[PDB]
């Protein structure tokens, strides 16, 4: 119950057995006793580098702006971004360099990241917009049906006169007062609403979520996502070699397959796409953070036989990257082709975001 | 953000039809109650029985409810066995009972 309530502390005994079980219970030794789970901060998900291991050069520290390299390593080949780097109002204003992993769980080289993509510092309001939209959209709207008073199949005639017998005054008695009747304003799939998401807010929240994953250190860049055979055992062997906990209980994996660095593609790899179907915590998404402009061709209820919620008639597809899936899946694996596609789709956006006195210097700088 | 998505329509609240409410607020059906185990106002919550609501469960135990009612033979194949989720699996142990012995709680075989 509420803490400001009499019923909050009315259980005085019977909650705890005075005898402790001889298997797990222990006594408090003192201040030097390291208690499992105890932490000063309120952590509703108290994980560490063993339960939820981070994949990054450094463990995310307050003395570091991000848990990745800030300068290219002299022993690893460095690959710059496919598009030039520009720092807008929200970027981290610092160089971000991440190692590219080989499918043999090895670091082949390193690659510069774009601050506009993985440097857009996260904001809780934007991430909340993203998550709320995703949940309200992913709800099932066909099951929102309910009966109305005019859908009860009773005689359209007053059952008894109002003044005759001791019964109360009623007519058709098919309303909500009776256990068999329906409501005047019932739930209907077409009366429900589907929210609209603008491309600006969607892209901003997705880039904030990517930046949040990078800051937490759970972003991993691989060169390819390919399997020798399209079977599930090959996918599970790849996951076991790459230390991907795709179990229903482990830290899930979110793949963004965009192809290789030399061979990028907007379609998923066929072998990996056929192998990735496993009953666990793994999800593959399209290599894009943008979305199509949503429309509504029934904004005034002109087509009455419409079956479907009010609002956008072009919602975001399921296989798109989103805050809900990013939060549910611990690690985020992204390919170099997906990186290239994100950069190519966000270049003109950040250029139009740029201010005019800086925009006039773009052809000057190249 | 043009009219951000409503928080009440986020699918985390299926409440009883109240006096106040938006046109886009999906309340509970007529004649149906909001909480499943609250047959009466004094009905207790089942200890280990879990009714999966909303999405499809990732791991469905044999004694948990999902689109089904409680049937003894279906939810308890062996009453002396206790099923649980160990390492994203269905692991079954011998059901036990706690008894006071020498000032501590000791585990004895529940069936015996």
């Amino acid at each position: 119950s509420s803490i400001f309530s009499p019923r909050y502390d009315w259980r005085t005994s019977g909650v705890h057995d005075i005898a402790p079980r001889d298997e797990g219970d222990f006594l408090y030794q003192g201040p030097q006793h390291v208690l499992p789970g105890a932490h000063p901060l309120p952590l509703h998900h108290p994980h560490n580098t063993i339960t939820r291991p981070v994949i990054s050069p450094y463990i995310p520290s307050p003395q570091r702006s991000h848990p990745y390299f800030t300068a290219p390593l002299p022993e690893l080949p460095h690959f710059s971004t496919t598009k030039p780097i520009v720092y807008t109002y929200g970027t981290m204003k610092e160089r971000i360099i991440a190692p590219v992993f080989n499918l043999k769980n090895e670091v082949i080289y390193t690659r510069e990241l774009d601050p506009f993509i993985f440097g857009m510092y996260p904001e809780v309001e934007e991430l909340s917009k993203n998550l709320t939209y995703w949940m309200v959209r992913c709800q099932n709207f066909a099951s929102k049906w309910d009966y109305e008073t005019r859908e009860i199949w009773r005689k359209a005639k007053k059952n008894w006169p109002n003044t005759g017998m001791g019964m109360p005054r009623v007519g058709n008695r098919k309303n909500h007062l009776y256990t068999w009747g329906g409501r005047t304003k019932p739930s209907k799939p077409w009366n429900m609403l589907m929210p609209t998401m603008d491309v600006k807010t969607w892209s901003k929240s997705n880039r904030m979520m990517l930046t949040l994953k990078m800051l937490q250190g759970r972003l991993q860049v691989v060169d390819r996502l390919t399997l020798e055979e399209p079977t599930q055992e090959c996918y599970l062997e790849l996951c076991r070699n790459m230390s991907w906990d795709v179990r229903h209980t482990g830290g899930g994996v979110l793949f963004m397959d965009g192809g290789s660095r030399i061979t990028p593609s907007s379609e998923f790899d066929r072998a990996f796409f056929f192998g990735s179907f496993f009953n666990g915590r793994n999800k593959i998404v399209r290599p894009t953070v943008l979305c199509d402009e949503q429309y509504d061709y029934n904004k005034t209820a002109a087509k009455q036989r419409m079956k479907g919620p009010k609002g956008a008639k072009n919602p975001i597809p399921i296989n798109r990257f989103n805050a809900y899936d990013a939060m549910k899946h611990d690690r985020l694996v992204i390919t170099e082709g997906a990186l290239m596609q994100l950069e190519d789709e966000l270049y003109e956006h950040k250029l139009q975001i740029l201010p005019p006195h800086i925009r006039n210097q773009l052809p000057e700088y190249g | 953000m043009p009219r951000p998505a409503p928080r009440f329509a986020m699918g985390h609240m299926l409440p009883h039809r109240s006096n106040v409410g938006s046109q886009f607020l999906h309340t509970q059906r007529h004649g149906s109650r909001s909480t499943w185990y609250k047959k009466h106002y004094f009905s207790l919550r089942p200890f280990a029985i879990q009714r999966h609501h909303g999405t499809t469960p990732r791991i469905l135990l044999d004694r948990s409810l999902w689109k089904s009612l409680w049937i003894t033979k279906l939810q308890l194949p062996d009453i002396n066995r206790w099923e649980r989720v160990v390492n994203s699996r269905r692991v079954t142990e011998d059901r036990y009972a706690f008894v006071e012995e020498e000032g501590v709680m000791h585990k004895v075989n529940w069936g015996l």
Binding site: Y147, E151, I152, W153, R154, K174, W180, Q304 | -
Partner: peptide, 22 residues
């Protein structure tokens, strides 16, 4: 209503999406 009520076992008029105003 009830789950197996005679009121809902038989079919009746089905309400449609209402038209909006000008």
């Amino acid at each position: 209503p009830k789950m197996g009520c005679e009121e809902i076992t038989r079919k009746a008029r089905r309400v449609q999406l209402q038209p909006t105003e000008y």
